[PDB]
Amino acid sequence: MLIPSKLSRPVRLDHTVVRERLLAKLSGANNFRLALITSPAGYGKTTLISQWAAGKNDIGWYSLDEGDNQQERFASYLIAAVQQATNGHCAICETMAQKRQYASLTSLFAQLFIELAEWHSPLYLVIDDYHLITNPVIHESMRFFIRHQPENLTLVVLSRNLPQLGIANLRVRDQLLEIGSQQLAFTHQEANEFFDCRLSSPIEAAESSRICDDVSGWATALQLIALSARQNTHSAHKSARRLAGINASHLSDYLVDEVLDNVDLATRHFLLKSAILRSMNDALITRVTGEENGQMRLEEIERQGLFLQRMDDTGEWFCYHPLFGNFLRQRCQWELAAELPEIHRAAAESWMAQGFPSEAIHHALAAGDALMLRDILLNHAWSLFNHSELSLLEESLKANPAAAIAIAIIEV
Amino acid sequence: MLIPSKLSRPVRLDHTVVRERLLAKLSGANNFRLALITSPAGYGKTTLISQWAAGKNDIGWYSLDEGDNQQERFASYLIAAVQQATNGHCAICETMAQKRQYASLTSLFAQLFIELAEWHSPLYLVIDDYHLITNPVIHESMRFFIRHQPENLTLVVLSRNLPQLGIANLRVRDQLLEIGSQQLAFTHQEANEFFDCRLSSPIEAAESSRICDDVSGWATALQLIALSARQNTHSAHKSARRLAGINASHLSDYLVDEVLDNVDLATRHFLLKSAILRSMNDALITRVTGEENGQMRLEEIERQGLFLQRMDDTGEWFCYHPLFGNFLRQRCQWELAAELPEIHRAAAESWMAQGFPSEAIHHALAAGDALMLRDILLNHAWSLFNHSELSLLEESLKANPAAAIAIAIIEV
Amino acid sequence: MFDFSKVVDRHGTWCTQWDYVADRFGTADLLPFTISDMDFATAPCIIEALNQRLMHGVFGYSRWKNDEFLAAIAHWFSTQHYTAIDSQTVVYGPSVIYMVSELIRQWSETGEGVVIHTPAYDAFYKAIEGNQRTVMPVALEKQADGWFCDMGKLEAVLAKPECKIMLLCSPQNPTGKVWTCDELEIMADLCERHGVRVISDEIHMDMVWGEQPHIPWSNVARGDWALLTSGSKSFNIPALTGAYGIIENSSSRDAYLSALKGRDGLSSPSVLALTAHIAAYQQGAPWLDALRIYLKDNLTYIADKMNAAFPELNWQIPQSTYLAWLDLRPLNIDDNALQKALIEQEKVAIMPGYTYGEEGRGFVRLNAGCPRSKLEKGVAGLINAIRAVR
Amino acid sequence: MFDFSKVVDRHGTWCTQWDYVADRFGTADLLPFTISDMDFATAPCIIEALNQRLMHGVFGYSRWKNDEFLAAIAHWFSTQHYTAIDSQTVVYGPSVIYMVSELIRQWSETGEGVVIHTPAYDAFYKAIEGNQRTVMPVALEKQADGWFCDMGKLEAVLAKPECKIMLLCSPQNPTGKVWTCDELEIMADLCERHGVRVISDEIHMDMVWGEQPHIPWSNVARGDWALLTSGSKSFNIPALTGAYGIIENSSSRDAYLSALKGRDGLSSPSVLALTAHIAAYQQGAPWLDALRIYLKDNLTYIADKMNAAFPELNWQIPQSTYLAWLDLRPLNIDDNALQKALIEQEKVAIMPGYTYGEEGRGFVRLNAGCPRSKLEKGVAGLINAIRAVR
Ligand SMILES: Nc1ncnc2c1ncn2[C@@H]1O[C@H](COP(=O)(O)OP(=O)(O)O)[C@@H](O)[C@H]1O
Ligand SMILES: Nc1ncnc2c1ncn2[C@@H]1O[C@H](COP(=O)(O)OP(=O)(O)O)[C@@H](O)[C@H]1O
């Protein structure tokens, strides 16, 4: 099954500045073959793409994670995004993706374009966080995609750095629209507006501008100063001094000192436990953290401004900002290194309870519980075979090899 | 046939000084396997070896030239030296050498040692100028020789530099006697005696000693100052100044200025023409230079002290000292570059007249006269086949290439 | 800034151009234009970096699977060719041709074929036939503007059941042709369809003069492939042997690495080659841009002088190299006569064209990677030797 | 004069010993003794010569068929091993093992054999089996004084119709055995009788401690043979890849040169390797003699300490190397326990013996080519780790 949190446009822009400077740049995105948005994490480019997408309906969205680095799952999710963009129009390729009766991604995409050519309206497909893909087969197939896509389609790729998509080819023929790191940074006026809409005390515009440059207009930096001033930790300029020119390592200990220590310990445990989950909803929260007012807890966290974001307006699924998420994971692997395997097991069984065996497998192999995978297998052999999760099967057991021998005796 | 000049010990005893220390060093040469005498040319080591050999009768001698660098001729001459040392004792290996019914030099030498073991008296074999050999097969076979020779045999090798004879093996087992460059140089007393016996004006020992060291006791240097003072070119110290520390190039122009220009032009032509001959006697002289009092000319030259040396006491064969010889060759290849081919032809036909086809071939290919080799072949096909000069035949043709192409037609 | 208008002696340094007559000539007193290095001194940044690695003093074993080497390679590709690479696929080799030969030994048997575009670089024939693999050539055709591979004949060749590898030189040598995006698209599709793997030799990637940028093989690359290059020709440091490449289908990368380290024992790199490449790629961009300007000026000077001396040549400067591949066929002159006139009457050594085989008849190959002082003498000599035999 | 009693950092220079835990260990905070280079800085003469070749600036193509390279090689042989060589038979190669592998590919087919003496150097197995040639080993036997090849078993092996090459390591590695004249005589005669060509790897020729010196292969050499070496181990410059050799039967020398230049494109040498070798061979004798003294002092210190800590070892310093091949079998200790104790309780990495296969069980290989400061810590660690597991 497909995790809905991966196929929906993020929302919850309760206080987001909107700038034409970038929306105007994106306005002509239909004339090109690819709109490439690249910058370090925390730019707010994804927020801009969600903004730009709030005014269309025929637009698919696809968020990536490391697990996408397997090719069959990648194809399934991509065709799902295509359906959402065309409202179920591409049925044949959809069944081919669900039944895995395709020789290679290129043949699947050739079939998709057969169906794609019939659609006559502008089409858009957004692929978020492409830097997490390291499979060369996927890169190759995506290059084929960009080379053969119908002209009414436009692909939007959000990445940390230049991807291996054959960009120089497009740049030669002027089929490429780029929005680089420099354009994405907040200017002085935008910083003024941002601190206006989010703070209790109003800041003079020049002071906000001084905060704006010494941090290079970096969005998450601004969010950090804002939330710090919300608890009235500092006067703004002092926090900005603490943040000016901060590298990855110093961002970590800053997070440790100012965001983790200024909350109650119960919320600290909640965050550290919930961090290991990719996408979180009420059920997974109440299972892993034990706290029962799960939806209450998540919505109150999101109110507190701790980099939790919805993944649909229904308020069902939630996700951490990858920076803060990875930080919380690395901190939890120490502050609670002892409580990790049982937490992974609880997460795995709760995932299986909701019908998602793949995330269950991931969290189980994280826990290192063999007989957990044994039960996952005798509990979903029907769906594992009928939906052909065979490469999942090979990797899982191969990744307890003496226990795995089972796959050795299955090989012959 | 074998050129007698190559198989006889040089026998000049006029102004030569007797160096007793080196003879004492050589006195024990029977206990070793190899006596290696090395130094640059002009040391007088060869003169010492002849002096050391004037007191033995069971001692073979073998002078080398570049033509020896072919293996069959090398074996023939070596076995000839062995016969001279043992008075025809080794008949079987002699016939095997003359009939070339041997697989390889090592098998020939194994046969020779079978015969060599029977002889019960001390035996000596002198090989002069080993640096002219560059054939690796010959080096290999000579190493085998030194490794397997009977203990009553002792090999004496005169060379410019360390040869490839497997010397470190012998040095390890203390079977090697060396006389290096440093020992061979003339000391102060020897220089005093030398200038006494050879000059018309007595030389004070200290002045002779100064002349001795500033030229490093180098023999040919001393001979040069002596002969220069014989014509009373200079006072001795001035010539020594001209000679002190002189390198190869400056030796050449010194020879040009002081020895060539201080003789009459007729003798100059005589020298320059005769230089191209390896070994010279009366017949070859009167043929090439046209001057008929050939033996008269040679003996008067030897009286004049121009580095002409006998190769037997009978006064038949003569040779130039390799330094002066090569200098005369290089000078004749300019002063008479036009008259070279006819001179080479005269030399070749005169060699054939005396019964030596090999030197005739050498001088002919020097001349570049194809039909000369044609006549050499139809004139000595009987001896070329009956004495099996077949490798001679193969090499000569490549250097009459169309005739060689006919030989290639013969190839089949 | 930098100065290229000066002559370095290069006498007594064992260099194959200025110290060795054979077999470039016989007179040994010639002005040499035969060998394809540059007369320039390499960048001062590389020199300073080597100088600083020397003051360390120790030259023990070193490792090429570095983190600064790979970072520098990736930075060079991203900022100079707008191509991104998976830096965990970069492999090392002693020379470009060694890697070519190893891959040929790997991706084909004995007696099978290797497509190349002729006139090809000399060493390609050596590498291909030395392994007993047959060359299957496809001739570029000069016409109105540059050289054009005919995809019909290329596809006809690739269809053969023996052709297994395509040795693509990009930018081409010696014609200097830079392949366009469309050409690369069609070549890659044809190769993939007929089961032919591709080896892209890209050692000239930096010396491009046309307005269209050179395009890397990786962007059009599919399945097993390889992209081999070095900073030797670009920065004039071939005396520091070292090359790198990108091999895909990690099974093939691993087979190559096994052959390089295990079977042939060449895995220990030259620490000074790595130092040079790192310094060059991280700091040698201003030097390289100045050099690019100078080399284009030299090529256009050649073109002016020649096209003004014989109005019926119509020679255009090449798309990308510093080797002028001059076409003298519109002068109806014989090349042996021209070569004798150049050697004797003029004392200028200029590599003839027939050495490239039959496709080279009527051409000459003039090395323009030299100070203009020497280029003036060379082109004056060529003009005179043409007139004196016309 | 010279000073070897000082520690050079060697941190951050990509060196496989001090910068890379894997796979020498896992703790990455160890005192490393695993890799066989020397911790010393190379001779100041080599450094000055390289420094002066750098100020030239130009690094174009160079030629190894030089006249100073060959003269230096011949001078080294004549004055250090009393052997004369025909300098027109010297050939170049990137590394010793590359030349070994090329000659194996040349003087045998696939599936035939290559005799070696075990415990053999590691890379010999790689080079022999990478070409799909079977190894045919002959075990040295340690006894009262050093190691002794048994010519009966050796001759029994050579008699095989498959054995075609003998890969003789002289001085041997890692035992350090220097072959005597008689041994070399008998080996050469046996090889010639049974039609086996010989490849003599002599890269350790300079580090001889015994009173009887090292005798090169050429003096006993016949027919086809080869003598390969380098000044890398002797002067600690393996980071300047380059080796030379002597091949005979000029047909074989020519076949090798063709393969090196044509098929594999490795003919362009590293000009700095040649500069280093020339300077080393012409001026590096005082430095090398001082280093010889120091290394022998280190080996004898090891011997004193060990033989005093466990009187039942009776370990004699090797004949020729700076690698102590310590025999710990008379202590009845298990090597895995010892290795765990060394890694964890002591933090000292010492290459175990079983990595040399079965003949290495019970030994350790201790690199003594380091300042004494480090050697004291290493030997103290080994003694402690033995006692703590005895
Ligand atoms: N227009 C905006 N107004 C206010 N805050 C913003 C805006 N855009 C981004 N931010 C803040 O900066 C962060 C940007 O995250 P973003 O860069 O969109 O994630 P991604 O790594 O997916 O690109 C968000 O946490 C958001 O709070
Ligand atoms: N004992 C001696 N007394 C006088 N002159 C000598 C003596 N020994 C050598 N010479 C002179 O020095 C030269 C030495 O030549 P020599 O070195 O014997 O030739 P080779 O090159 O064969 O060794 C001879 O010309 C000779 O005149």
Tab-separated table of C-alpha atoms in Angstrom, chain A residues 228-329:
chain	number	residue	atom	x	y	z
A	228	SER	CA	13.299	31.689	20.549
A	229	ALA	CA	11.813	35.153	21.029
A	230	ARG	CA	8.352	33.632	21.426
A	231	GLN	CA	9.472	32.076	24.705
A	232	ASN	CA	11.311	35.388	25.256
A	233	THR	CA	14.624	33.575	25.512
A	234	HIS	CA	16.577	36.593	24.264
A	235	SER	CA	16.353	39.905	22.592
A	236	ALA	CA	16.403	39.125	18.882
A	237	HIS	CA	19.869	40.461	18.070
A	238	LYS	CA	21.519	38.249	20.695
A	239	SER	CA	19.968	35.093	19.269
A	240	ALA	CA	20.957	36.255	15.792
A	241	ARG	CA	24.521	36.630	17.058
A	242	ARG	CA	24.308	33.070	18.351
A	243	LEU	CA	23.099	31.951	14.911
A	244	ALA	CA	25.221	34.072	12.563
A	245	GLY	CA	27.292	31.952	10.200
A	246	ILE	CA	26.569	28.753	12.118
A	247	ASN	CA	27.712	25.468	10.573
A	248	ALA	CA	26.108	22.040	10.859
A	249	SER	CA	27.914	21.066	14.066
A	250	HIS	CA	27.158	24.293	15.913
A	251	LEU	CA	23.555	24.109	14.754
A	252	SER	CA	23.359	20.795	16.601
A	253	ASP	CA	24.577	22.055	19.967
A	254	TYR	CA	22.498	25.200	19.516
A	255	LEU	CA	19.436	22.993	19.110
A	256	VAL	CA	20.595	21.076	22.180
A	257	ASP	CA	20.908	24.186	24.316
A	258	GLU	CA	18.016	26.400	23.251
A	259	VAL	CA	15.145	24.229	21.919
A	260	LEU	CA	15.535	20.977	23.855
A	261	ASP	CA	16.318	22.449	27.269
A	262	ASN	CA	13.563	25.081	27.151
A	263	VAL	CA	10.715	22.548	27.031
A	264	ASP	CA	9.429	20.185	29.689
A	265	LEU	CA	10.997	16.746	29.923
A	266	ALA	CA	7.801	14.936	28.932
A	267	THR	CA	7.689	16.732	25.585
A	268	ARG	CA	11.403	16.005	25.251
A	269	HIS	CA	10.757	12.287	25.574
A	270	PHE	CA	7.834	12.614	23.171
A	271	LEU	CA	10.007	14.249	20.518
A	272	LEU	CA	12.929	11.871	20.951
A	273	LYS	CA	10.704	8.815	20.658
A	274	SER	CA	8.598	10.109	17.767
A	275	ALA	CA	11.691	11.150	15.805
A	276	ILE	CA	12.446	7.642	14.566
A	277	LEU	CA	9.190	7.608	12.610
A	278	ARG	CA	9.186	8.793	9.024
A	279	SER	CA	5.561	9.946	8.962
A	280	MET	CA	3.516	10.181	12.140
A	281	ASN	CA	-0.211	10.208	12.824
A	282	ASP	CA	-2.321	9.786	15.942
A	283	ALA	CA	-2.209	5.983	16.055
A	284	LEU	CA	1.562	5.651	15.715
A	285	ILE	CA	2.069	8.393	18.297
A	286	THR	CA	-0.222	6.830	20.889
A	287	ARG	CA	1.401	3.465	20.266
A	288	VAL	CA	5.049	4.489	20.491
A	289	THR	CA	4.942	7.263	23.085
A	290	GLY	CA	2.127	5.668	25.079
A	291	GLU	CA	0.471	9.076	25.480
A	292	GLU	CA	-3.140	8.616	24.429
A	293	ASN	CA	-4.171	12.188	23.505
A	294	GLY	CA	-1.984	11.665	20.460
A	295	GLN	CA	-3.694	14.018	18.019
A	296	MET	CA	-3.871	16.563	20.847
A	297	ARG	CA	-0.135	16.156	21.392
A	298	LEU	CA	0.722	16.583	17.716
A	299	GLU	CA	-1.459	19.641	17.192
A	300	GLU	CA	-0.129	21.271	20.341
A	301	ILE	CA	3.432	20.574	19.204
A	302	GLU	CA	2.661	22.149	15.831
A	303	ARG	CA	1.305	25.143	17.731
A	304	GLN	CA	4.562	25.400	19.672
A	305	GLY	CA	6.526	25.833	16.444
A	306	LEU	CA	8.922	22.876	16.635
A	307	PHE	CA	9.267	22.173	12.896
A	308	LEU	CA	6.333	19.786	12.694
A	309	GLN	CA	4.385	20.140	9.469
A	310	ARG	CA	1.184	18.588	8.226
A	311	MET	CA	1.147	16.597	5.028
A	312	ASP	CA	-2.514	17.251	4.273
A	313	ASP	CA	-5.097	19.771	5.407
A	314	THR	CA	-7.112	17.000	7.081
A	315	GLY	CA	-4.531	17.167	9.863
A	316	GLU	CA	-3.980	13.433	9.658
A	317	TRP	CA	-0.300	12.905	8.791
A	318	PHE	CA	2.662	14.843	10.161
A	319	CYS	CA	6.383	15.067	9.452
A	320	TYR	CA	9.438	16.704	10.945
A	321	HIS	CA	11.588	19.077	8.968
A	322	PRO	CA	14.530	16.911	7.817
A	323	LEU	CA	17.111	19.025	9.652
A	324	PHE	CA	15.287	18.915	12.978
A	325	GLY	CA	14.248	15.329	12.314
A	326	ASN	CA	17.768	14.038	11.787
A	327	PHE	CA	18.939	16.014	14.806
A	328	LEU	CA	16.270	14.419	16.972
A	329	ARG	CA	17.188	10.979	15.649
